[model samples]
Target: TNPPPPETSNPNKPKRQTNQLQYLLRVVLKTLWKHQFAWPFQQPVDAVKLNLPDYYKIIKTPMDMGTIKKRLENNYYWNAQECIQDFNTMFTNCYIYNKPGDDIVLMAEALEKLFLQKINELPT
Candidate 1:
C-alpha cells in the first residue's frame, strides 16, 4: 500500500487565532492594571466594606481587572471586541454606582480612554 499523506501542521485560510488574541488581551490588561487610575479597579468591589449595600442593585453588571484577567486566562472572551466590551461595562458600572463629579468617575473616564486607545492600536 502507498504511504499515507503527511499531516499538515498549519491550517489553511488563516484567521483569528485564540492564542494570539489571548496574548493581546493580556498585554492590554497589563497596561490597564499598571495605570495610576487602576487602583480602584484591580479587584471586585467590597460592598460591605465600602458600606455600599445598594451597589449591586444599581450596577447590573460588575467587572474588574482581576475578573477580566481570569476571563482571559479561562478563554471567556471570543475576540478583542468582547474583551473591550467588558472594560466598557466596568467603566459604566462605576459611572452608575458613583455620584456625579466623583473622583472614581474621573478615573473611569481616563482609564476608559486609555483602554480604548490601547485596543484601537490593534488591527481592525
Candidate 2:
C-alpha cells in the first residue's frame, strides 16, 4: 500500500544531518570553553607545571576541553552524546582531584551545571 521506490531518496540524507550535528556540537564546545570557569579545564593538567607529581596517580582518567575540541575537529565523535560524556568526565576529574570546598571544585560544579543546561537546550 505504498508508492514506488523512486518517491523517496536516501543517499546523503543522513550524512547531511550528521554534519549538522557536528556543527551544533562545535557551537556547544565553544560556548563551554569560553565560560569564566573554563580555564582549569582548557588544557591537560601538567603535573610539573603545578608541581603536583601525584596528579596522575589521583586522577587516572584525565579529560580537558582542548582534547574534546581536537576530537570534534577530527570527527572522532559519531554522536553528540559522546561529546557530552567527555565534558562530564572532564568535570569529574576536576572533582576528584580538588577538595569539595576548594575554589576550583566550585568552579567545576558551576561549569558542569552550565554544560548540562546548554546540552539540554540542544535538539533531540
Candidate 3:
C-alpha cells in the first residue's frame, strides 16, 4: 500500500477554533463583561473562567469604556457586530467555527437583552 499523506498545519489558521454559538457566547460575555458601561452596570467578570477558551487572543487589548471614543482597537464606528467579527477574523480557515449568521444575529440580540436587563434595568 502507498504511504498516507502527512498532515500539515496552516499558518493562516487559528490554533483553537470556536463555533458560531460559542463565538456568540463569547461576544455576549465580552460585551456584558468588558464592553461599554456606566456606573455600576453589568459588573465585571473574569473572561478566563468562561467558556471563552480563547478570550485572551480575541481582544487586541484590555476593555475600556472610559472615553468618548471608546471601542475595540479604538474602532469608534464599531458595535457588538464589529467587535465579534474582529475576533472571528483571527481564525484563518475556521477549523471549528461556522458562518456569522444566526449565531452572529443572536449575539446582537443577546447583547441587547443583557444590556436592557443589566444596564437598562428593563421590566421595571
Candidate 4:
C-alpha cells in the first residue's frame, strides 16, 4: 500500500511571514554594522562608498536617527540576552544549514576571529 500523503502545506502561514521579515531585518542591520566596524578604519565615507542602498535609503530619508540611534545606543544590543539569542538564530539559519561547505565554516571562523581581534585592540 502507498504511504499516507503528507499534510497539506499552508503557503500563507503568518509565522513563516513573520520569520522572513525578522530574518531580513536582521540581515540589514548586521550588514550595516559589519561594514561600519569590520574595516581597518571606522570611516563613514567608506561606508557610503560601499553603496548599501537599502541601508542608505533608510538613513537618507526623514533623517531617521531613531533607527540609527537604536543600533548605536544598543551597541547592537550585544549585552542583551534576547539580542544574543536572536543573533544565534540568525547566524545558524542563514549560514549553518545542513551540509554547509568548508569555505563557509572557514569564513565564519575568520569573522569570529576578526571580531575578537578588534575587541582586543579597543582601549580599556
TM-score winner among the candidates?
2
Q: Taking the tens digit of each residue's C-alpha lDDT, what string does model 4 give over 33-65? A: 565333321222223455544433332212111
Whole-model lDDT, candidate 2? 0.71
Evaluate all candidate structures by whole-model CA lDDT and list the values in order.
0.74, 0.71, 0.35, 0.36
In model 4, the worst 10-residue window by lDDT is 57-66
Candidate 2 lDDT at 22 equals: 62
Higher TM-score: candidate 1 or 4?
A: 1
- Give the alpha carbon lDDT tens digit for every residue of 1-124 in model 2: 1112111222343333374366445667888788888888888887777888777888766778888887666566657776777878888888888889899998988877877777767865
**Cα lDDT of model 1 by residue, 1-124, tens digit:** 1222212233343445575476556668888888899999988887877777788777666778877877666566667777777778888889888998899999888888877777777765
How many residue pairs clash per model?
Answer: 0, 0, 0, 0
Name model 1 segments beyond 4 Å from true. 1-20
TM-score of each: 0.78, 0.79, 0.22, 0.28
Q: Is candidate 1 or candidate 2 better by TM-score?
A: 2
User: Candidate 2 — which residues are off by over 4 angstroms?
Assistant: 1-20
What TM-score does prediction 4 earn? Answer: 0.28
lDDT tens readout by residue for model 3, 1-124: 1122212223454343234333333444345656443222232223544455553454333332222112332333223444444333322212123245545344544545664453332112
Q: What's the lDDT for candidate 4?
A: 0.36
